[PDB]
Every structure is written in structure tokens, then in C-alpha cells.
């Protein structure tokens, strides 16, 4: 009935009965209808049918008479930047993100790197491109190669103090992904030691699908950390805008944690900024950035509403507990490369490993992490959940599924807007054990 590919925020399918290069180039003729005036930004990740997608997809394009510029194999935040950048009508990054090894996607953003999702263009694009049964018409317009990445990377380096940087020793992980060209590019101006796991660009993903969230590709970074008395480790999903961190001795860093820590990071930077955070886990952040004299903004998460909500509150800084982190010098956009020079910059500056920086708030706010759950009836599952607790009368927000504030500890209970799941994660103040009995006492009545 619909094309599958084409999801809430992106688009993504198996190659190539869900995704191939006519619906590329389909797509391609599609966007260009879309979009404002100017030319179309297109990169891509290392995916061996990435390229193809690309060509296809710029073929598409100049057949509907748009310039095209072919940034290369990139990472999704070179998409973003170089779409703000170069004043495009529009960008187009190719990547298969995690998913298996016969998948492919899409990630469409328009001008100044706004997101395209299925409520704001691509479901217009995915029934045009459901109903186009044309002739394939021939290019009119140009494809200029701009491989350049001088302004990314100065954009990238300005955020950091480069005097005040020590010669850290960081174990770096691209997980064959594309994230190890970047950090050499970096690396002649930087004075940090690198040890690099991973580090070669192979679609053929000899060592996993790159995903630090899985407990064997996280223990590859882990053990090169303690073995080599690295500072921190860090580690890359394919297209390398989520980031991950693991201190000096090897412990991988719960997402949340970084957001309250890059909060205080920039905002030492710009005083009295505004922060966005996501309503899953909150108290850290709050007060993390309330003490560094920022105020916190919540937001519905997902990086469609994060971005747009830190435009109209002009906003410095976005951070969701997932991995991902936004900036408003970088087009509002997300970045995996700017969160760990920030990191390294306030490890250098302060004489404090990155353990020393989180441990106080990860004994102040220990959460659960976000714990999901495939059940028969998601509506029922909730609503099992919000009796059983109805009679202790918590303070109840609904900007994002269901967040419940019984004053000593707190939970979010959603559904995926990218998977047919529910998503649970639970805080406490400053009480492991009963983050433990409440997590387990929701988990039963969801599994009920
Ligand atoms: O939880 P979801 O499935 O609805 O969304 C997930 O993908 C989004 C886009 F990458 C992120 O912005 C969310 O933070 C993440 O959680
Ligand atoms: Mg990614």
C-alpha cells in the first residue's frame, strides 16, 4: 500500500527490493520539486551501494534541472554542515546507519539544514515518487566534486581553545565506519596521541556493523583504553554523528551524563545560554545546567523537534541521553566530532579525568538506561503501569509519552516514533536501590 522505506525521519530498507537506484533517482526528481531555489548537497557513507544511490540520486536531480554538489565520502554531519554552508537548497546524505548489510537509506534535509521528515516533506516525496511512472528525462543541470573540508574542519576547531590543550592520549574507534578520516584530518592540529582501533573505512565491515552500544564493539574500545592507559576512548557509530565515551578505565559513559557535562562546557563559553534536553531523563541536565547559568529547555525527543525548538529559543546547545548532541553554531545540527574535542578541552583544562567528571552526578541521578519492550498491546502495557502508581499521585507531563515525578525518583514511558516499541527509562535521587526495585516493578507490569 505505502512504500516501506520511507519512515518518520528518514528513509531506509533492504536493497534492493525496499530501496535501489530507480527509486533513488525517483526520489532525486521528487526532492527537487520540494525544495527552494539552489543546488543540492550529496554525500554519502561507506557503504558499498552507497556511491550508486548517490549517482542515482544526483541523476534525478539534474534531470529536474538542480546543480549538484558532490561532497564525497563524508559523515551525515558533513551533509549538514556543508548544505548551511555552501547556502543549499537542500542535502541528501546515503547512509544505512546500523541496520543490516543489504540496507541502504537516506537522510533529506532543506535550507540551512532543516530536516525533512514524513510530516514535513517526505511523505509528499514518498507519494510522488509512489506514483511517478515518467520517462526518465536527461540531466540539465551540472554536478561540481567539492571535496574540500578546510571550513568543516576549521568549523570544528573552533571550538576549543587550542593552547589549552594537552597532550591527551585518546584511543580513537570508527569502527570501519567513515569517522577515522576526519580524526586525521584533525590530528595535525592537535597535540593529543592517538590510538586508533578500527580506523580503516571497510563497507565490508570485517569487525561488525559499527554500533558501540553492543556489548562485544564495546568492549573493543574498552580493552584499548586500559591496555594503552589511554585518557578516554572514543567510539563512532558508521556515519559518525552519535559519539561514545569510555573513561580511563574502560567504562563506557551513560549518554545522559554527557549531556549535563557538554551543557557546562559551552555554556562557560556563552554565559546565560539557553540548553534543550529530552524529557526521558531530566534532573542531571536541570541542574547541571542551572548551576553553569544556562537555563534548560525541555523538548519532545527526536532530532526533528530538538533542532526546531533550539532555532526558536536560540538555543547554544541540544543534548539527547542517545548519543546525540546539537549546536547552534553548526547549523543547529548534530555533530559526533565536536562533543569529544569539547571533552578533551575540559579534561585538559581541569586536570580531571573524564571519570572524576561524571562520577559525583552518576551517584547524584542513577538511571536505568533506556530499557525497551516489545509487548502485545502497548496502550494496555501503560496503562497497567499508570494504575499500579495512580494512588501515590505523581506529577504527571505528557510533551513525550508519559513522564511520571514522584519526588524521590521519576520515569518516561514512550513509543518509538522509528520501531513499534516502548522505551522506559527511570531516575532516582541519589538511590540505586530504589532505582532498582521501581525499574523492576515497572518491567514486570509492561512484560504483564
Ligand atoms: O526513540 P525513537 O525511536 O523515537 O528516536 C530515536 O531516533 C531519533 C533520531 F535519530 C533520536 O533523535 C532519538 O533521540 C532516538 O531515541
Ligand atoms: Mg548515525
Not at 526528481?29 to 544526483?58: I, K, T
Not at 511517478?132 to 573540508?149: C, F, H, L, M, V
Request: hydrophobic share 40%; proline share 5%.
Amino acid at each position: 500500500m505505502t512504500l516501506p522505506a520511507f519512515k518518520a525521519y528518514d528513509i531506509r530498507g533492504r536493497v534492493p527490493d525496499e530501496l535501489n537506484e530507480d527509486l533513488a533517482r525517483r526520489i532525486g526528481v521528487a526532492l527537487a520539486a520540494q525544495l527552494d531555489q539552489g543546488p543540492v548537497v550529496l554525500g554519502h557513507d561507506v557503504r558499498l551501494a552507497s556511491p550508486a544511490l548517490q549517482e542515482a540520486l544526483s541523476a534525478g536531480l539534474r534531470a529536474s534541472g538542480r546543480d549538484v554538489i558532490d561532497i564525497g565520502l563524508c559523515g551525515t554531519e558533513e551533509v549538514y554542515f556543508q548544505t548551511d554552508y555552501l547556502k543549499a537548497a537542500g542535502g541528501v546524505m546515503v547512509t544505512a546507519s546500523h541496520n543490516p548489510m543489504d540496507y541502504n537509506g537516506m537522510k533529506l534535509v532543506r535550507e540551512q539544514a532543516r530536516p525533512i521528515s514524513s510530516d514535513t516533506g517526505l511523505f509528499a516525496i514518498r507519494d510522488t515518487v509512489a506514483a511517478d511512472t515518467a520517462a526518465p528525462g536527461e540531466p540539465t543541470a551540472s554536478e561540481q566534486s567539492r571535496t574540500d573540508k578546510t571550513a568543516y574542519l576549521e568549523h570544528l576547531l573552533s571550538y576549543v581553545d587550542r593552547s589549552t590543550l594537552k597532550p591527551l592520549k585518546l584511543v580513537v574507534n570508527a569502527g570501519n565506519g567513515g569517522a577515522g578520516l576526519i580524526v586525521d584530518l584533525l590530528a595535525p592540529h592537535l597535540p593529543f596521541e592517538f590510538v586508533r582501533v578500527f580506523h580503516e573505512p571497510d563497507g565490508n565491515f570485517p569487525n561488525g556493523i559499527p554500533n558501540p552500544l553492543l556489548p562485544e564493539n564495546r568492549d573493543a574500545t574498552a580493552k584499548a583504553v586500559k591496555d594503552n592507559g589511554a585518557d578516554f576512548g572514543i567510539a563512532w557509530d558508521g556515519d559518525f554523528d552519535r559519539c561514545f565515551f569510555f573513561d580511563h578505565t574502560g567504562r563506557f559513559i551513560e549518554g545522559y551524563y554527557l549531556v549535563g557535562l557538554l551543557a557546562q562546557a559551552i555554556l562557560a563559553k556563552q554565559p546565560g545560554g539557553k540548553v534543550v534536553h529530552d524529557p526521558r531523563l531530566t534532573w542531571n541536565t536541570v541542574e547541571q545546567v542551572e548551576e553553569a547559568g544556562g537555563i534548560p529547555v525541555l523538548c519532545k525527543s527526536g532530532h526533528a523537534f530538538i533542532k526546531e525548538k533550539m532555532r526558536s529559543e536560540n538555543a547554544v546547545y541540544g543534548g539527547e541521553m542517545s548519543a546525540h548532541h546539537y549546536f547552534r553554531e553548526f547549523a543547529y545540527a548534530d555533530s559526533g566530532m565536536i562533543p569529544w574535542l569539547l571533552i578533551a578541552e575540559l579534561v585538559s583544562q581541569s586536570g580531571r579525568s573524564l571519570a572524576d567528571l561524571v562520577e559525583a552526578r552518576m551517584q547524584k541521578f542513577p538511571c536505568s538506561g533506556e530499557i525497551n519492550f516489545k509487548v502485545a498491546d502497548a496502550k494496555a502495557s501503560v496503562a497497567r503501569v499508570m494504575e499500579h502508581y495512580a494512588s501515590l499521585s505523581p506529577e504527571l507531563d505528557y510533551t513525550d509519552g508519559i513522564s511520571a515525578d514522584f519526588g524521590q525518583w521519576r520515569f518516561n514511558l514512550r513509543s518509538s516514533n522509528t520501531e513499534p516499541l516502548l522505551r522506559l527509562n527511570v531516575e532516582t535521587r541519589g538511590d540505586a536501590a530504589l532505582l532498582e526495585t521501581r525499574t523492576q516493578e515497572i518491567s514486570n507490569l509492561l512484560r504483564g
